[PDB]
Amino acid sequence: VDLAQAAERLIKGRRAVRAFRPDEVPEETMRAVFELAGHAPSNSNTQPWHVEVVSGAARDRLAEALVTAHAEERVTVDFPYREGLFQGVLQERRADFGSRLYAALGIARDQTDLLQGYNTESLRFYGAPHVAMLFAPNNTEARIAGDMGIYAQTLMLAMTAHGIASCPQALLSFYADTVRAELGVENRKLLMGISFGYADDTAAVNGVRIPRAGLSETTRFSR
Amino acid sequence: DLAQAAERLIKGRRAVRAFRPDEVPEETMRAVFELAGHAPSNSNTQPWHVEVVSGAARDRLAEALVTAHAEERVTVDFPYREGLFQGVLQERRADFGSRLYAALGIARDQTDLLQGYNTESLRFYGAPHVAMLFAPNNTEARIAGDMGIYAQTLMLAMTAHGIASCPQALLSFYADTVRAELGVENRKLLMGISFGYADDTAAVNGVRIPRAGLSETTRFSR
Ligand SMILES: Cc1cc2nc3c(=O)[nH]c(=O)nc-3n(C[C@H](O)[C@H](O)[C@H](O)COP(=O)(O)O)c2cc1C
Ligand SMILES: Cc1cc2nc3c(=O)[nH]c(=O)nc-3n(C[C@H](O)[C@H](O)[C@H](O)COP(=O)(O)O)c2cc1C
């Protein structure tokens, strides 16, 4: 494999996978992936990421604790919402994404109980055998969060290289106190979780094709 | 195989601080920026707006930045405050600075050499191109996280085509200058990425910045 071809395969090949098989990723592969991900750059080489990887019985207890917290409305999010977050084209993109996702799931926006069933499964990591919880410093702001994103993408691409499917999930960060309590983590903020393992390629949700805006919408070249 | 290629890309990408004058071919530049667009983001919002500057426009921009710095016209959209980094994060920052300044041959009390180096950084380290990464006006942690996902996708796509890069928060400290020179309004500047082909004879390009061990950043439980 030539480098240019490999980058295209990894970058386009990585997709948000929402249905996994139960098979675990070998421990040596997980070590190789997370070691590689640590090579992400960051402001001043600060490497602000603290990553909690959960498997087996601990992963099962964590999934049940998230389902229970969600049922009890114990929302404990570390990052507040900012008014007007998605205006204009950002809102159009979110609406189009939601439309494609629900169409692949075979659910209509008015089918509340089916949306509930789907979201309960999301808290069970879509059946993934592993989850990586991406913790950040208590004083995380835009620059540190940018580095958390550099790391998240490095990790997802290293996973893709090993045939490991992933789903980045902001949803898991909405129950940060539950994750911290389960894992014994103190004084860190939870930005997102990444469910991972091997994709169930028979699931219609994994057939969803999410477009991108393209150069004219995002990029300008000047000289 | 793909596993080896990922290792080569991820480990091969380094912050390059001395460039050759040679421009990236137009078709390669378009391929790299189109590929970077495949970065994921919350709800597929793709909040990035990227201004790629080359040639005379890049020269005018570099000179405007040098002038803004000399006149102390610092304009920051995202604060970079003292105490942003504490504990081990502050020590990693100090350790990085020590390695960089040793490669540059600049001592602690050398203000004139430090000024000359800062001027060269505002000239994009001689890179023929710079990508300015603009974010929405209301950017907070989650949107900034997506900007980082994009920035790393772009740097890795560049590395795959043998294109060296340096992500630079420094360029975001003169946000009004960048906006005025590029006709950009109502977007915040998070960082710039200088890019082109590495000058392999430059001592600064020999620096190798380590990472904390896997045991230091990651915990596995079952
Ligand atoms: C930081 C971040 C948070 C995300 N949060 C969720 C989430 O909570 N649940 C979910 O189903 N997908 C989530 N997504 C996945 C996307 O919606 C997805 O990346 C986008 O639709 C682009 O599709 P693709 O990744 O398949 O190319 C998240 C993506 C990112 C980068
Ligand atoms: C968001 C971001 C901002 C950065 N700002 C600068 C900068 O202003 N000037 C600079 O020389 N390097 C800057 N760096 C580059 C690093 O310091 C570098 O990525 C870190 O030391 C790790 O080294 P490596 O990328 O060579 O592996 C920045 C890196 C990132 C990811």
Short mmCIF file of C-alpha atoms and ligand atoms in Angstrom, two decimals:
data_model
loop_
_atom_site.label_atom_id
_atom_site.label_comp_id
_atom_site.label_asym_id
_atom_site.label_seq_id
_atom_site.Cartn_x
_atom_site.Cartn_y
_atom_site.Cartn_z
CA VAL A 1 0.00 0.00 0.00
CA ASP A 2 1.30 3.47 -1.13
CA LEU A 3 0.95 6.25 1.57
CA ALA A 4 -1.48 8.50 -0.38
CA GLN A 5 -3.74 5.44 -1.03
CA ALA A 6 -3.53 4.36 2.64
CA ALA A 7 -4.55 7.84 3.93
CA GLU A 8 -7.58 7.80 1.55
CA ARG A 9 -8.54 4.28 2.77
CA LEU A 10 -8.26 5.22 6.47
CA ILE A 11 -9.89 8.67 6.24
CA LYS A 12 -12.79 7.67 3.96
CA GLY A 13 -12.97 4.12 5.42
CA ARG A 14 -13.60 5.27 8.99
CA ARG A 15 -17.39 5.66 9.54
CA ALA A 16 -19.59 6.11 12.68
CA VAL A 17 -20.66 2.47 13.32
CA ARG A 18 -23.88 1.97 15.38
CA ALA A 19 -24.12 -1.85 15.62
CA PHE A 20 -21.27 -4.09 16.71
CA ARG A 21 -20.56 -7.79 16.98
CA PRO A 22 -19.66 -9.02 20.53
CA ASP A 23 -16.09 -10.20 19.61
CA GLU A 24 -13.33 -8.52 21.59
CA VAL A 25 -10.32 -6.75 20.12
CA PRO A 26 -7.15 -8.71 21.15
CA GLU A 27 -5.32 -7.01 24.07
CA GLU A 28 -2.07 -6.70 22.02
CA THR A 29 -3.98 -4.93 19.18
CA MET A 30 -5.63 -2.54 21.67
CA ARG A 31 -2.15 -1.78 23.09
CA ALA A 32 -0.76 -1.06 19.55
CA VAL A 33 -3.76 1.19 18.72
CA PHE A 34 -3.73 3.30 21.93
CA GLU A 35 0.10 3.60 21.85
CA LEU A 36 -0.10 4.88 18.28
CA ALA A 37 -2.90 7.34 19.19
CA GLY A 38 -0.61 8.91 21.82
CA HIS A 39 1.47 10.28 18.88
CA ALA A 40 -1.22 12.89 18.22
CA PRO A 41 0.25 16.47 18.36
CA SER A 42 -1.05 19.06 20.88
CA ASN A 43 -0.37 22.63 22.05
CA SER A 44 3.18 22.52 23.54
CA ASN A 45 3.06 18.68 23.53
CA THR A 46 0.69 18.93 26.60
CA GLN A 47 -1.14 15.67 25.58
CA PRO A 48 -4.21 16.69 27.68
CA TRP A 49 -6.05 13.43 27.05
CA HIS A 50 -6.72 10.97 29.91
CA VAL A 51 -8.27 7.86 28.29
CA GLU A 52 -10.28 5.23 30.21
CA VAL A 53 -10.75 2.04 28.16
CA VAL A 54 -13.46 -0.26 29.54
CA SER A 55 -14.04 -3.94 28.63
CA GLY A 56 -15.70 -7.12 29.97
CA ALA A 57 -17.74 -7.08 33.23
CA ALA A 58 -16.68 -3.43 33.97
CA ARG A 59 -18.04 -2.45 30.49
CA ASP A 60 -21.29 -4.35 31.27
CA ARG A 61 -21.66 -2.57 34.68
CA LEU A 62 -20.88 0.80 33.07
CA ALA A 63 -23.56 0.22 30.32
CA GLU A 64 -26.21 -0.68 32.96
CA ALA A 65 -25.27 2.32 35.13
CA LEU A 66 -25.66 4.64 32.06
CA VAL A 67 -29.07 3.11 31.18
CA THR A 68 -30.17 3.58 34.84
CA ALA A 69 -28.82 7.22 35.00
CA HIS A 70 -30.67 8.02 31.70
CA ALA A 71 -33.91 6.44 33.04
CA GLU A 72 -33.61 8.51 36.28
CA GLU A 73 -32.81 11.75 34.24
CA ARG A 74 -29.49 12.10 36.14
CA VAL A 75 -27.86 14.25 33.44
CA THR A 76 -24.39 15.29 34.66
CA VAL A 77 -22.76 16.95 31.70
CA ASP A 78 -19.40 18.75 32.11
CA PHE A 79 -19.68 20.92 29.00
CA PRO A 80 -22.68 23.46 28.90
CA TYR A 81 -24.63 24.17 25.70
CA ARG A 82 -23.97 27.47 23.91
CA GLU A 83 -26.90 29.35 22.43
CA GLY A 84 -27.11 29.43 18.63
CA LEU A 85 -24.63 26.50 18.39
CA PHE A 86 -26.16 25.34 15.06
CA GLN A 87 -27.34 28.27 12.89
CA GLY A 88 -27.81 28.34 9.10
CA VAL A 89 -25.91 25.64 7.19
CA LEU A 90 -24.82 23.91 10.48
CA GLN A 91 -28.51 23.36 11.31
CA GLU A 92 -29.26 22.15 7.70
CA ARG A 93 -26.39 19.58 8.05
CA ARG A 94 -27.66 18.35 11.46
CA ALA A 95 -31.25 18.04 10.10
CA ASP A 96 -30.05 16.14 6.99
CA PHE A 97 -27.91 13.83 9.20
CA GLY A 98 -30.89 13.12 11.51
CA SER A 99 -33.11 12.41 8.46
CA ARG A 100 -30.59 9.91 6.97
CA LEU A 101 -29.97 8.21 10.34
CA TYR A 102 -33.70 7.73 11.14
CA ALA A 103 -34.39 6.56 7.54
CA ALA A 104 -31.61 3.86 7.91
CA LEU A 105 -33.11 2.87 11.32
CA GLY A 106 -36.62 2.72 9.78
CA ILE A 107 -37.94 5.17 12.46
CA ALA A 108 -40.06 8.36 12.08
CA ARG A 109 -39.43 11.44 14.36
CA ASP A 110 -42.93 10.92 15.91
CA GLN A 111 -42.18 7.29 16.99
CA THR A 112 -41.03 8.35 20.54
CA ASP A 113 -40.81 4.76 21.92
CA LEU A 114 -38.68 3.53 18.97
CA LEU A 115 -36.37 6.56 19.43
CA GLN A 116 -36.20 5.47 23.14
CA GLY A 117 -35.28 1.83 22.24
CA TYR A 118 -32.57 3.09 19.86
CA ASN A 119 -31.20 5.48 22.49
CA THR A 120 -31.14 2.78 25.21
CA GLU A 121 -28.94 0.72 22.84
CA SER A 122 -26.68 3.80 22.30
CA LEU A 123 -26.01 3.79 26.10
CA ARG A 124 -25.08 0.11 25.80
CA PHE A 125 -22.37 1.25 23.32
CA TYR A 126 -24.40 -0.20 20.37
CA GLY A 127 -23.32 -3.66 21.60
CA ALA A 128 -19.59 -2.78 21.34
CA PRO A 129 -17.33 -4.90 23.59
CA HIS A 130 -15.19 -1.81 24.42
CA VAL A 131 -15.53 1.90 25.11
CA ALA A 132 -12.82 4.60 25.37
CA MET A 133 -13.90 7.52 27.62
CA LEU A 134 -11.98 10.65 26.69
CA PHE A 135 -11.37 12.73 29.82
CA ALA A 136 -9.84 16.19 29.73
CA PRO A 137 -8.56 18.77 32.29
CA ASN A 138 -11.07 20.56 34.59
CA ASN A 139 -10.26 23.87 32.90
CA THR A 140 -10.68 22.60 29.28
CA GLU A 141 -11.64 25.41 26.92
CA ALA A 142 -11.50 25.69 23.09
CA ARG A 143 -7.73 25.19 22.65
CA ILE A 144 -7.53 22.12 24.91
CA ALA A 145 -10.76 20.69 23.38
CA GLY A 146 -9.13 21.11 19.92
CA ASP A 147 -6.28 18.85 21.08
CA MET A 148 -8.82 16.32 22.45
CA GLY A 149 -10.28 16.24 18.88
CA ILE A 150 -6.80 15.78 17.28
CA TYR A 151 -6.33 12.80 19.64
CA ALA A 152 -9.87 11.38 18.97
CA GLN A 153 -9.30 11.37 15.18
CA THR A 154 -5.77 9.87 15.55
CA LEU A 155 -7.31 7.10 17.68
CA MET A 156 -10.24 6.44 15.28
CA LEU A 157 -7.89 6.25 12.27
CA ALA A 158 -5.45 3.91 14.14
CA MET A 159 -8.54 1.74 14.98
CA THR A 160 -9.68 1.76 11.33
CA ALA A 161 -6.16 0.58 10.26
CA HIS A 162 -6.69 -2.56 12.40
CA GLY A 163 -10.25 -3.24 11.09
CA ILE A 164 -11.68 -1.82 14.32
CA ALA A 165 -14.97 0.05 13.90
CA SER A 166 -15.80 2.98 16.18
CA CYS A 167 -18.54 5.47 17.06
CA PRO A 168 -17.60 8.81 18.66
CA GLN A 169 -20.41 9.64 21.07
CA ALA A 170 -21.07 13.00 22.75
CA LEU A 171 -24.10 11.18 24.35
CA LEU A 172 -21.87 9.27 26.79
CA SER A 173 -20.48 12.58 28.12
CA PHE A 174 -24.03 13.58 29.25
CA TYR A 175 -23.69 11.15 32.22
CA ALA A 176 -20.11 12.12 33.20
CA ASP A 177 -20.69 11.67 37.00
CA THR A 178 -21.92 8.08 36.32
CA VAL A 179 -18.78 7.29 34.23
CA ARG A 180 -16.49 8.89 36.87
CA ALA A 181 -18.20 6.95 39.74
CA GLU A 182 -18.01 3.62 37.86
CA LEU A 183 -14.36 4.08 36.89
CA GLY A 184 -13.04 5.84 40.02
CA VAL A 185 -11.95 8.92 38.01
CA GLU A 186 -11.60 12.21 39.94
CA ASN A 187 -11.16 15.85 38.88
CA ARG A 188 -11.40 15.37 35.09
CA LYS A 189 -14.10 16.43 32.62
CA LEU A 190 -15.61 13.95 30.14
CA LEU A 191 -15.73 15.24 26.55
CA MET A 192 -16.93 12.12 24.71
CA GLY A 193 -16.85 8.35 24.62
CA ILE A 194 -15.83 6.22 21.64
CA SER A 195 -17.57 2.80 21.41
CA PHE A 196 -15.41 0.31 19.51
CA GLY A 197 -14.94 -3.26 18.29
CA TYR A 198 -16.01 -5.04 15.09
CA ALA A 199 -18.88 -3.74 13.00
CA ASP A 200 -22.03 -5.81 12.41
CA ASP A 201 -22.10 -5.21 8.63
CA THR A 202 -25.67 -6.72 8.39
CA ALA A 203 -27.22 -3.80 10.38
CA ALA A 204 -29.05 -1.28 8.18
CA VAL A 205 -27.83 1.59 10.42
CA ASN A 206 -24.28 0.72 9.23
CA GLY A 207 -25.43 1.21 5.60
CA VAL A 208 -26.13 4.95 6.22
CA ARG A 209 -24.05 7.16 3.92
CA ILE A 210 -23.40 10.58 5.39
CA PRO A 211 -22.25 13.10 2.78
CA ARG A 212 -19.69 15.87 3.16
CA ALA A 213 -20.09 19.51 2.12
CA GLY A 214 -17.24 19.56 -0.40
CA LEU A 215 -14.54 22.16 -1.18
CA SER A 216 -16.79 25.07 -2.34
CA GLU A 217 -18.58 25.00 1.00
CA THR A 218 -15.59 24.72 3.35
CA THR A 219 -12.39 25.79 1.62
CA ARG A 220 -10.98 28.79 -0.19
CA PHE A 221 -7.72 29.05 -1.99
CA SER A 222 -6.17 32.51 -2.53
CA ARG A 223 -2.92 33.76 -4.08
CA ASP B 1 -0.25 -3.24 5.02
CA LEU B 2 -2.72 -0.66 6.41
CA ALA B 3 -1.44 -1.04 10.02
CA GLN B 4 2.16 -0.15 8.90
CA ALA B 5 0.88 2.74 6.75
CA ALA B 6 -1.08 4.18 9.77
CA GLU B 7 2.10 3.92 11.91
CA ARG B 8 4.14 5.69 9.15
CA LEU B 9 1.55 8.51 8.82
CA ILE B 10 0.86 9.09 12.50
CA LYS B 11 4.46 8.78 13.67
CA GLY B 12 5.92 10.37 10.49
CA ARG B 13 3.95 13.63 10.87
CA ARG B 14 6.05 16.12 12.91
CA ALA B 15 5.86 19.89 13.49
CA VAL B 16 8.23 21.18 10.76
CA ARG B 17 9.77 24.64 11.33
CA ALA B 18 11.90 25.21 8.20
CA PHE B 19 10.61 24.78 4.66
CA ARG B 20 11.87 24.76 1.09
CA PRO B 21 10.29 27.40 -1.28
CA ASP B 22 8.74 24.75 -3.64
CA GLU B 23 4.95 24.96 -3.94
CA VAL B 24 2.59 22.00 -3.52
CA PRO B 25 1.06 21.19 -6.99
CA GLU B 26 -2.51 22.52 -7.33
CA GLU B 27 -4.05 19.08 -7.95
CA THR B 28 -2.30 17.67 -4.85
CA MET B 29 -3.50 20.61 -2.75
CA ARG B 30 -7.12 20.10 -3.91
CA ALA B 31 -6.89 16.31 -3.19
CA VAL B 32 -5.51 16.92 0.35
CA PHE B 33 -8.19 19.53 1.29
CA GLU B 34 -11.00 17.39 -0.21
CA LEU B 35 -9.76 14.36 1.76
CA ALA B 36 -9.56 16.42 5.02
CA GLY B 37 -13.28 17.21 4.53
CA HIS B 38 -14.02 13.53 5.41
CA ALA B 39 -13.28 14.29 9.07
CA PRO B 40 -16.30 13.36 11.28
CA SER B 41 -18.04 15.99 13.44
CA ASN B 42 -21.01 16.33 15.85
CA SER B 43 -24.17 15.76 13.74
CA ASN B 44 -22.02 16.06 10.53
CA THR B 45 -22.01 19.87 11.10
CA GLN B 46 -18.47 20.20 9.56
CA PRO B 47 -17.99 23.58 11.33
CA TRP B 48 -14.61 24.30 9.68
CA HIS B 49 -14.00 27.16 7.26
CA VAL B 50 -10.49 26.99 5.81
CA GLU B 51 -8.56 29.80 4.11
CA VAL B 52 -5.55 28.51 2.12
CA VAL B 53 -3.12 31.27 1.22
CA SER B 54 -0.21 31.09 -1.29
CA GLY B 55 1.99 33.33 -3.49
CA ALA B 56 1.82 37.14 -3.20
CA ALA B 57 -1.30 36.90 -0.94
CA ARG B 58 0.74 34.68 1.48
CA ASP B 59 3.65 37.23 1.34
CA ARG B 60 1.28 40.20 2.12
CA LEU B 61 -0.28 38.19 4.99
CA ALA B 62 3.17 37.27 6.45
CA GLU B 63 4.25 40.96 6.31
CA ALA B 64 0.94 42.13 7.92
CA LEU B 65 1.51 39.61 10.77
CA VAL B 66 5.17 40.76 11.28
CA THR B 67 3.94 44.42 11.42
CA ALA B 68 1.01 43.60 13.83
CA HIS B 69 3.45 41.77 16.17
CA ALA B 70 6.02 44.66 16.03
CA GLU B 71 3.22 47.16 16.87
CA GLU B 72 1.86 44.87 19.71
CA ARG B 73 -1.54 44.64 18.02
CA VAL B 74 -2.41 41.28 19.58
CA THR B 75 -6.04 40.27 18.77
CA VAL B 76 -7.05 36.87 20.21
CA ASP B 77 -10.39 35.12 19.70
CA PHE B 78 -9.67 32.19 22.03
CA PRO B 79 -7.72 33.23 25.19
CA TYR B 80 -4.34 31.53 25.90
CA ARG B 81 -3.95 32.50 29.57
CA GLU B 82 -1.09 31.94 32.03
CA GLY B 83 -2.06 28.93 34.14
CA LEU B 84 -4.02 27.25 31.32
CA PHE B 85 -1.52 24.37 31.91
CA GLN B 86 -0.74 23.09 35.41
CA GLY B 87 0.86 19.95 36.93
CA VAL B 88 2.12 17.42 34.39
CA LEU B 89 0.68 19.42 31.47
CA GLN B 90 2.87 22.41 32.46
CA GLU B 91 5.93 20.10 32.75
CA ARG B 92 5.29 18.58 29.28
CA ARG B 93 5.08 22.19 27.91
CA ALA B 94 8.35 23.16 29.71
CA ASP B 95 10.07 19.92 28.48
CA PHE B 96 8.93 20.58 24.89
CA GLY B 97 10.21 24.23 25.03
CA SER B 98 13.59 23.06 26.37
CA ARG B 99 13.97 20.60 23.46
CA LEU B 100 12.82 23.13 20.82
CA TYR B 101 15.04 25.99 22.12
CA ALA B 102 18.05 23.63 22.34
CA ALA B 103 17.55 22.61 18.62
CA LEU B 104 17.31 26.36 17.69
CA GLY B 105 20.40 27.16 19.78
CA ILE B 106 18.52 29.86 21.75
CA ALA B 107 19.29 30.36 25.48
CA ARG B 108 16.67 31.45 28.15
CA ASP B 109 17.79 35.15 28.39
CA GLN B 110 18.24 35.70 24.60
CA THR B 111 15.39 38.18 23.86
CA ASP B 112 16.87 39.38 20.49
CA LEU B 113 17.22 35.78 19.18
CA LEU B 114 13.74 34.93 20.56
CA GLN B 115 12.34 38.00 18.68
CA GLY B 116 14.02 36.91 15.41
CA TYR B 117 12.61 33.38 15.83
CA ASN B 118 9.06 34.75 16.52
CA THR B 119 9.32 36.91 13.32
CA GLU B 120 10.30 33.78 11.32
CA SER B 121 7.29 31.91 12.83
CA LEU B 122 4.95 34.75 11.64
CA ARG B 123 6.54 34.27 8.19
CA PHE B 124 5.22 30.63 8.40
CA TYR B 125 8.80 29.29 8.76
CA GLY B 126 9.31 30.09 5.04
CA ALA B 127 6.46 27.72 4.05
CA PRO B 128 4.92 28.54 0.63
CA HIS B 129 1.40 27.95 2.01
CA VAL B 130 -0.65 28.53 5.13
CA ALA B 131 -4.11 27.17 6.00
CA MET B 132 -6.05 29.43 8.42
CA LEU B 133 -8.65 27.39 10.40
CA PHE B 134 -11.71 29.48 11.08
CA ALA B 135 -14.46 28.38 13.42
CA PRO B 136 -18.01 29.68 14.13
CA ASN B 137 -18.38 32.85 16.25
CA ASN B 138 -20.03 30.87 19.07
CA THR B 139 -17.36 28.10 19.18
CA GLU B 140 -17.11 26.32 22.54
CA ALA B 141 -15.44 23.00 23.58
CA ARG B 142 -17.46 20.62 21.35
CA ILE B 143 -17.15 22.68 18.15
CA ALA B 144 -13.41 23.25 18.94
CA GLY B 145 -13.08 19.44 19.34
CA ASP B 146 -14.42 19.05 15.75
CA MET B 147 -11.91 21.69 14.53
CA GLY B 148 -9.12 19.50 16.03
CA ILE B 149 -10.54 16.36 14.34
CA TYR B 150 -10.36 18.29 11.04
CA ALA B 151 -6.82 19.72 11.71
CA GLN B 152 -5.38 16.22 12.36
CA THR B 153 -7.20 14.74 9.33
CA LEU B 154 -5.64 17.51 7.22
CA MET B 155 -2.11 17.10 8.66
CA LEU B 156 -2.20 13.31 8.10
CA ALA B 157 -3.57 13.77 4.49
CA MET B 158 -0.59 16.20 3.98
CA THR B 159 1.93 13.71 5.45
CA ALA B 160 0.56 11.00 3.04
CA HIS B 161 1.59 13.21 0.05
CA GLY B 162 5.03 14.00 1.59
CA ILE B 163 3.80 17.47 2.64
CA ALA B 164 5.33 18.80 5.90
CA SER B 165 3.27 20.99 8.23
CA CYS B 166 3.36 22.98 11.45
CA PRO B 167 0.15 23.68 13.38
CA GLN B 168 0.49 27.15 14.87
CA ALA B 169 -1.59 28.69 17.70
CA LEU B 170 0.73 31.74 17.30
CA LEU B 171 -1.07 32.84 14.09
CA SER B 172 -4.40 32.98 16.01
CA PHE B 173 -2.97 35.78 18.28
CA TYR B 174 -3.40 38.28 15.41
CA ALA B 175 -6.93 37.20 14.41
CA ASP B 176 -8.09 40.71 13.34
CA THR B 177 -5.05 40.98 11.02
CA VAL B 178 -5.71 37.59 9.40
CA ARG B 179 -9.44 38.47 9.03
CA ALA B 180 -8.71 41.93 7.48
CA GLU B 181 -6.12 40.51 4.98
CA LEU B 182 -8.43 37.64 3.89
CA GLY B 183 -11.79 39.44 3.85
CA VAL B 184 -13.13 37.12 6.57
CA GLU B 185 -15.83 38.33 8.97
CA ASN B 186 -17.89 36.74 11.76
CA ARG B 187 -15.62 33.70 12.20
CA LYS B 188 -13.08 33.02 14.94
CA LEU B 189 -9.50 31.98 14.21
CA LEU B 190 -8.39 28.91 16.12
CA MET B 191 -5.00 28.21 14.47
CA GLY B 192 -3.02 28.30 11.24
CA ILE B 193 -1.16 25.39 9.65
CA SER B 194 1.98 26.29 7.63
CA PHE B 195 2.75 23.68 4.97
CA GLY B 196 5.00 22.73 2.05
CA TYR B 197 8.19 20.62 1.82
CA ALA B 198 10.57 20.25 4.74
CA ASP B 199 14.07 21.69 4.51
CA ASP B 200 15.94 18.53 5.71
CA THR B 201 19.23 20.48 6.23
CA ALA B 202 17.66 22.60 9.02
CA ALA B 203 18.69 21.60 12.58
CA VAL B 204 15.18 22.50 13.92
CA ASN B 205 13.76 19.66 11.72
CA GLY B 206 15.97 17.11 13.53
CA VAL B 207 14.16 17.68 16.85
CA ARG B 208 12.19 14.61 18.00
CA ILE B 209 9.53 15.36 20.60
CA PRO B 210 8.62 12.39 22.81
CA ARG B 211 5.23 11.36 24.14
CA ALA B 212 4.25 10.27 27.67
CA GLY B 213 4.10 6.45 27.95
CA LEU B 214 0.82 4.56 27.22
CA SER B 215 0.56 3.89 31.03
CA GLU B 216 0.65 7.66 31.62
CA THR B 217 -2.27 8.68 29.38
CA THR B 218 -4.42 5.52 29.14
CA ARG B 219 -6.00 3.19 31.69
CA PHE B 220 -7.52 -0.21 30.79
CA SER B 221 -10.08 -1.82 33.05
CA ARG B 222 -12.26 -4.93 33.00
C1 LIG C 1 -17.24 14.66 18.71
C2 LIG C 1 -18.33 13.78 18.05
C3 LIG C 1 -19.46 13.42 18.81
C4 LIG C 1 -20.44 12.62 18.21
N1 LIG C 1 -21.57 12.26 18.96
C5 LIG C 1 -22.39 11.23 18.48
C6 LIG C 1 -23.37 10.65 19.30
O1 LIG C 1 -23.54 11.05 20.58
N2 LIG C 1 -24.12 9.65 18.82
C7 LIG C 1 -23.98 9.25 17.54
O2 LIG C 1 -24.80 8.29 17.06
N3 LIG C 1 -23.05 9.78 16.73
C8 LIG C 1 -22.25 10.77 17.17
N4 LIG C 1 -21.27 11.31 16.33
C9 LIG C 1 -21.04 10.64 15.03
C10 LIG C 1 -21.62 11.42 13.83
O3 LIG C 1 -22.80 11.84 13.80
C11 LIG C 1 -20.77 11.35 12.54
O4 LIG C 1 -19.35 11.39 12.74
C12 LIG C 1 -21.23 12.25 11.39
O5 LIG C 1 -22.61 11.94 11.13
C13 LIG C 1 -20.41 11.91 10.13
O6 LIG C 1 -20.66 10.54 9.73
P1 LIG C 1 -19.44 9.50 9.59
O7 LIG C 1 -18.55 9.58 10.89
O8 LIG C 1 -20.12 8.10 9.49
O9 LIG C 1 -18.66 9.79 8.37
C14 LIG C 1 -20.28 12.14 16.89
C15 LIG C 1 -19.17 12.51 16.14
C16 LIG C 1 -18.17 13.29 16.74
C17 LIG C 1 -16.93 13.66 15.91
C1 LIG C 2 -3.26 23.20 18.14
C2 LIG C 2 -1.72 23.28 18.07
C3 LIG C 2 -1.09 24.52 18.17
C4 LIG C 2 0.30 24.59 18.09
N1 LIG C 2 0.95 25.85 18.17
C5 LIG C 2 2.31 25.92 17.80
C6 LIG C 2 2.91 27.15 17.52
O1 LIG C 2 2.21 28.29 17.65
N2 LIG C 2 4.20 27.19 17.19
C7 LIG C 2 4.91 26.05 17.07
O2 LIG C 2 6.21 26.11 16.72
N3 LIG C 2 4.36 24.85 17.31
C8 LIG C 2 3.07 24.76 17.68
N4 LIG C 2 2.49 23.50 17.84
C9 LIG C 2 3.28 22.29 17.46
C10 LIG C 2 3.81 21.51 18.68
O3 LIG C 2 4.28 22.09 19.67
C11 LIG C 2 3.96 19.99 18.49
O4 LIG C 2 2.85 19.40 17.76
C12 LIG C 2 4.26 19.23 19.79
O5 LIG C 2 5.50 19.76 20.33
C13 LIG C 2 4.46 17.75 19.44
O6 LIG C 2 5.56 17.63 18.50
P1 LIG C 2 5.41 16.93 17.08
O7 LIG C 2 4.11 17.52 16.37
O8 LIG C 2 6.67 17.41 16.24
O9 LIG C 2 5.31 15.45 17.22
C14 LIG C 2 1.07 23.42 17.92
C15 LIG C 2 0.43 22.18 17.87
C16 LIG C 2 -0.96 22.10 17.91
C17 LIG C 2 -1.62 20.72 17.76
#
